[PDB]
């Protein structure tokens, strides 16, 4: 499991692309789910 | 422990056979450690030899503008790698590739011998000796 | 014939569409209103602005600065009217940047820009821009350094189009044509854009034909807080960066902060330390190298407070 | 290296075709809202 | 296509126009404001930073 | 490794050994292969500990500086905003 | 014999002299209380200080910094008592600087300092200092890296003496002896100092045997303003610099500004933005190159406000 | 400088001269020594003017930045101090 | 003057003392404070930055 | 007059020494004469 | 003015003697301007020759460490002066002094020819040609 | 260059004499206030 995920997330030719895409997915969810409004406001 | 240590010391001092058994084991290990070092040195020597061989396959630029640009890139690549102690082999290869492209290798060697760190110079020095074609 | 044109136009108006605005603004709410990228600076800065009128608008500004790639001095003057806007600013080294916008029609605007540098011949440039703003779309064409002196069209040309598909969805297009020298073939690039806009949140995307993708999301977190996230992907090697940030609108100050996947952290605090004076503090921290750039600046607008009898001229074509 | 004259003519045609394909899309977008209206009215 | 003599003359117009814009653009803006502003400022105050 | 070579150390004595030699004999008790292999693991283990502490220290610094650089200006701006709200509310 | 010693001591006490203080402090009122030299910095800085007690004094401090020659992190701890003071601070790179001062007698103090750097063997050092404070004079002897391992005295030794001549005039002496290596001859340098002190103004001078002269003047300009001027001359080439500056003591802030003959301008503003929080802004402008260094920092002392029942221990030998 | 060499330009005509040549003749009226010496002074005078303006501009920048860097923090600090004095005086 | 063997031993004392001060000086100061402060702080609070 | 003063003040081996000494003389006079107290306070 | 200009133009066009008087004055001035340039060039040439002569009197270091230190100082001095257009003669002299101390002048010339600005190179090139002792 | 042994002895004597001259001044300063007192009492 971890071997198939860590390699594709930090030691691959597209590691920088995956990290940017995943971070965007989290950020949008954090905002859209209303948690951000409940924490930052 | 002290009773065993006293007996062990007493046996080693007064029993020659006990020393002989221990000495034989130590001497046997001494051979293995030296042999291991030689095997490690040969493998390192093989890596140096491999690195010089790899440079021949990629080839070198022929035009003066490409030679200068390639030389600067190899110097820049070697210097960039020279800061990392894990890239001393790769840094030396870039310096070796550049040295082979520079028109006056002897002058560049004096620059490397003073500007490049000794651990990289040691590998590069063997590269020069291995590549008998270097002028 | 007008018979079909009138019927077509009438059916169009009944759709309730609206002008989506310039293509370059589809990410404004994130990239300019929330992210610090456009406000970050380093060193010391001081802007002394004098307003002489509001209708027509006329103000003169002296900027003193001491920092990374900041010119020691910059004199700028601008004049505005509901039909035109002219601005020019010159550095201590004589680099002159200018703008001249004129409304030939309320729906058609011509924008002219120049950048004359004495030191460098390459720097000198001229940009002509034409904009049309229909009831539901915007079209634009630009000509940067257009020349036919060599007997063939040369320079850079850009065409932009953005169309409102529904009251919330906007789709657009951008096209570039280039020919740096008549001896070499023309290069063309196309970019597709789109946006979905609502009161609480806005989503935008910008796709280059080269493969690069820029996407952003903006959401309001109440009356005083709003935040957005911006993502950039490049496939020139594969590289990508995602920036998350938020903006707070207090009474006497606005605080912006953001962090991105490359480990950079930056914040900007603008504070009204006085009625005519506004302070700005900017700090950018690179966590991978542990280095920080500090910026402190000030803005002073003496003229505006002493002339309240005339209100700002409308629709100045900035 | 410098391009040959026939290759330049190939590039000039290619570039023109790309911009023509763009303007074809712009015309589609201008007509797109009426198409989207029909879909909401198909059901 | 284009005559060589014509290209020299056309290029000369750009050279002259470049210099004029370099020197004349900012004073032109200041002139437009000074004569059309409401009210009209003093010549000294016209470029005073904050007085 | 010859019986005649090892036989050269035919005689030994407890008193002849020097204090340094007697202390060195204590280290001789441990098999050289094990002690050499234990020392190797010790270096690898000690390096990992130093790497973990450097990473843990570097992470804590990042969080501390991030909270300060963002929390300090915000706390001042937010605090000052509350004062204006209080003074306006007192009217 | 005590007969003369008592009569001599009695005649001495009736002269009304007073202890002039350490030689290194004869210019404190200018070089530290008015000039910005000791407060200037660049980049971002944050000091988080926790006070655990006031008698005995004990506080722990974490400093975060990102700027020119500022270590990313520094942990410092100190303990103090009316008879002793111990402090140590360590950088992220392990450089440890320490101090240990002990009062063997109220008039005699021993100061020990160390500077241990793992990276550089040259950096490691040790400084032993002995001070005596008579009723009208102060004497001091220092030994930096004192060693006799080579069979001869080596290192750096310094002796300082300052004597009050009258209730206002103080005259002093300083002597240095050095021997970096037993193979080379010892080097000795002497410095003469003096000061005239009054309530409104203070004048000081420091003359090196090498020919360099450092002179300063300090004058109070009221209860909230004081200013001073400092001059330095060197004859190593002939070079000299004169610095003029003033300090303002407002209720919630202290503003310092200075300019010198080399065209540098600098100012420091320390402002109590909150009861436990103090801000610092520093800017240094070089008018000959038009470059500026901006420094922003903060200090937080959470512990002190919550323990008012014990007052600070007296005469801690800082 | 020989009468025979200068005599080669025996004949001339007003119509033969080209517009550029007729315009160039206007410059020929001024003695070359004077015009060459006037141009030299013009360069030296123009350089001095540019040096004076650069120095005057550089001095004004120094005074402007000095007054701002010192006057701005002081004016804010001094102003805030007066408020505390006013609020304390109102007690 | 000085015996060569003595110089080796004396130098060794500095080497050991240097290491001890490097590691032991700060914990010593923290120990003095923790046991002699009035009041005595919590072990967790002893190095908390502001809590 | 000026020739004998300007040379010794800006284009001499000790020009930097003279400028520092003169500036100090002015600064002290400005403070001691009471003008500084009347202007800066 | 126009009446005089018309008469002047009329006289120049129709009176050959008027042209001859003017042409003689112009030709006489043309000689002086060319002669002045040659005098200026010789004075500049003398300064270059003087600069090379001055370097011989100060002498050059003999030890390798002093030669390298002196070379670096001369390169640093030449580069520091090279930024000021008024020190091109002094900068070239430092580059000339360094070039005379460097062990492989030909390689250093290629560096200067590419890294040093042409106005300084022109003076330095004449210095090399004037100093026939340069290898 | 490295110094000769006789030059070192010359330097060692010189250095000692300098510090001895300093201590002689310190003794004068310690006695200086009584001297200054006499001057005010001479008139
Ligand atoms: C009315 C006064 C206020 C408005 C001033 C408008 C200035 C317009 C441009 C002036 C000329 C600039 C120029 O020639 O630059 C190239 C020159 C370059 O040097 P040059 O003049 O040797 O080269 C010229 C080269 N050609 C001919 C090809 C263009 O740069 C300068 O002269 C340096 C100064 C530029 C301007 C600095 C800021 C403006 C002056 C101060 C602010 C205004 C007064 C405030 C009180
Ligand atoms: C308004 C009048 C037209 C422009 C006047 C000259 C502006 C000059 C300038 O800023 O840049 C020169 C520019 C371009 O100058 P260019 O075509 O001579 O090219 C030199 C500049 N580079 C190398 C960067 C391309 O002006 C133009 O584009 C003039 C042609 C367009 C006229 C309509
Ligand atoms: C909590 C977990 C971490 C506690 C501190 C651990 C310190 C470990 C260490 O050596 O850190 C070095 C690191 C730096 O590591 P570095 O690798 O950048 O530098 C050290 C490099 N060598 C080892 C080669 C000398 O320390 C810091 O950056 C600061 C750590 C403390 C942060 C603040 C803690 C108190 C406030 C909360
Ligand atoms: C990580 C940031 C940590 C900041 C440090 C702690 C802040 C403590 C604030 C204390 C306070 O006064 O609370 C006020 C309030 C508490 O009170 P309140 O306003 O919620 O309710 C009470 C209101 N009255 C008093 C009127 C009745 O808390 C907040 O609103 C906190 C909101 C979060 C602010 C955090 C800083 C900005 C975050 C920006 C996020 C965007 C990306 C940033 C990237 C960098 C950071 C990862
Ligand atoms: C009790 C905990 C709080 C007090 C900590 C005191 C630390 C004293 C020194 C520790 C060792 C430093 C060292 O060996 O440095 C040389 C080493 C050099 O690497 P080395 O260990 O490979 O080399 C050692 C070399 N000899 C043996 C010659 C000395 O540096 C480090 O280990 C880097 C980190 C230094 C310390 C960083 C700051 C202190 C830790 C964080 C703050 C305290 C906790 C806050 C919560
Ligand atoms: C307290 C005990 C005495 C000092 C313990 C060691 C301190 C080591 C240190 O910080 O620097 C070494 C220093 C000097 O080390 P050193 O004499 O070995 O010289 C190495 C350092 N340089 C090259 C810079 C001179 O310690 C001493 O001075 C020890 C002798 C004085 C003892 C009394
Ligand atoms: C008042 C007297 C000065 C009025 C402005 C004169 C501007 C002259 C000039 O060219 O300045 C260049 C100087 C800079 O000179 P410089 O020499 O640093 O840069 C120009 C270099 N050349 C000529 C090669 C391109 O301008 C400034 O530094 C700003 C001048 C204006 C300062 C502020 C004025 C308004 C506020 C009071
Ligand atoms: C040059 C500096 C110019 C600064 C810019 C102008 C400041 C205007 C102040 C306006 C104001 O509010 O005045 C308050 C007051 C005016 O009011 P007042 O306090 O005098 O009297 C009224 C008092 N009440 C209101 C209570 C009745 O002016 C001052 O006190 C001015 C003192 C001078 C301050 C100048 C800045 C610091 C100077 C430091 C000098 C040391 C060397 C510095 C080197 C760098 C500078 C050369
Ligand atoms: C050129 C590229 C095309 C895609 C894009 O540009 C780039 O163009 C936009 C299209 C958008 C989606 C369209 C419609 C909806 C339905 C809506 O439903 C809410 C409820 C509502 C209707 O039922 C009633 O209240 C939720 C959001 C979603 C999925 C949009 C997400 C963002 C998207 C993907 C945007 C994206 C940036
Ligand atoms: C964990 C790491 C260490 C600790 C730390 O995070 C990182 O924890 C954060 C909490 C912040 C404080 C919260 C609230 C306030 C009140 C505000 O208002 C004063 C109004 C005035 C009216 O008279 C007095 O009440 C002043 C600032 C202050 C103290 C903040 C300072 C920064 C602090 C200490 C931050 C600090 C860097
Ligand atoms: C080692 C060097 C020796 C000089 C020095 O250290 C360096 O030592 C100090 C001696 C000082 C002077 C001594 C006495 C007076 C008389 C006094 O008279 C006021 C009125 C008063 C007495 O009549 C009654 O109120 C005015 C000032 C003046 C001239 C001093 C100036 C500063 C001087 C020069 C100081 C200088 C720094
Ligand atoms: C000549 C050059 C250009 C102009 C300039 O010198 C250089 O001239 C200086 C005068 C300064 C101002 C004097 C007084 C105040 C009031 C103070 O207090 C607000 C209290 C608040 C209470 O509600 C509102 O009243 C705020 C700051 C301000 C405006 C100064 C700003 C900096 C200024 C503009 C300086 C500026 C840089
Ligand atoms: C050696 C170098 C040469 C320059 C310099 O030292 C260095 O030489 C010093 C001479 C000093 C002045 C002497 C006397 C006065 C008169 C007094 O006025 C109140 C007198 C009172 C009597 O009742 C009422 O008249 C005010 C002070 C002033 C002007 C001194 C200023 C500082 C000066 C200029 C010093 C200056 C720095």
Numbering used by the authors:
A (entry chain G), J (entry chain H): 16 to 56
B (entry chain K), K (entry chain L): 22 to 156
C (entry chain A), G (entry chain B): 21 to 256, 265, 267 to 347
D (entry chain E), L (entry chain F): 8 to 50
E (entry chain I), I (entry chain J): 21 to 71
F (entry chain C), H (entry chain D): 28 to 118
Reproduce passages from the article.
The translocase of the outer mitochondrial membrane (TOM) is the entry gate for the majority of proteins imported into mitochondria as precursor proteins, or preproteins. In humans and fungi, the TOM core complex is a membrane-embedded dimer of twofold symmetry, consisting of two copies each of the β-barrel Tom40 pore, the α-helical Tom22 receptor, and the small α-helical structural subunits Tom5, Tom6, and Tom7 (3). Two other preprotein receptors, Tom20 and Tom70, are loosely bound to the TOM core, forming the TOM holo complex. We determined TOM core and holo structures with and without the bound MTS of rat aldehyde dehydrogenase (pALDH), revealing numerous interaction sites with the Tom20 receptor and the Tom40 translocation pore.
Applying 3D variability analysis to the same set of particles resulted in two unique classes of the TOM holo complex that exhibited a major connecting density above the cytoplasmic face of the Tom40 twin pores. Joint refinement of these two classes resulted in a C2-symmetrical map of the TOM holo complex at 3.2 Å resolution. Likewise, in our 3.2 Å resolution structure of the symmetric TOM holo complex, two copies of the Tom20 receptor interact with each other at their receptor domains and are stabilized by the cytoplasmic domain of Tom22, consistent with our previous N. crassa model. The symmetric Tom20 receptors extend along the membrane plane and rest above the twin Tom40 pores. On closer inspection, we found that the hydrophobic binding grooves of the Tom20 receptors are oriented toward each other. We refer to this as the “handshake” conformation, in which both Tom20s rest at the center of the complex. Symmetry-relaxed refinement results in additional densities corresponding to the preprotein pALDH caught in mid-translocation inside both Tom40 pores near the hydrophobic pocket of the Tom20 TPRs. In the difference map, three elongated densities occupy the space inside one of the Tom40 translocation pores, suggesting multiple preprotein binding sites. The longest preprotein density interacts with the loop between Tom40 strands β2-β3 on the cytoplasmic side of the pore, suggesting a possible entrance contact site, in accordance with previously published cross-linking studies. On the cytoplasmic side, the preprotein appears in two positions as it interacts with each Tom20 receptor domain, between helices α4- α5 in one case, and α3 in the other.
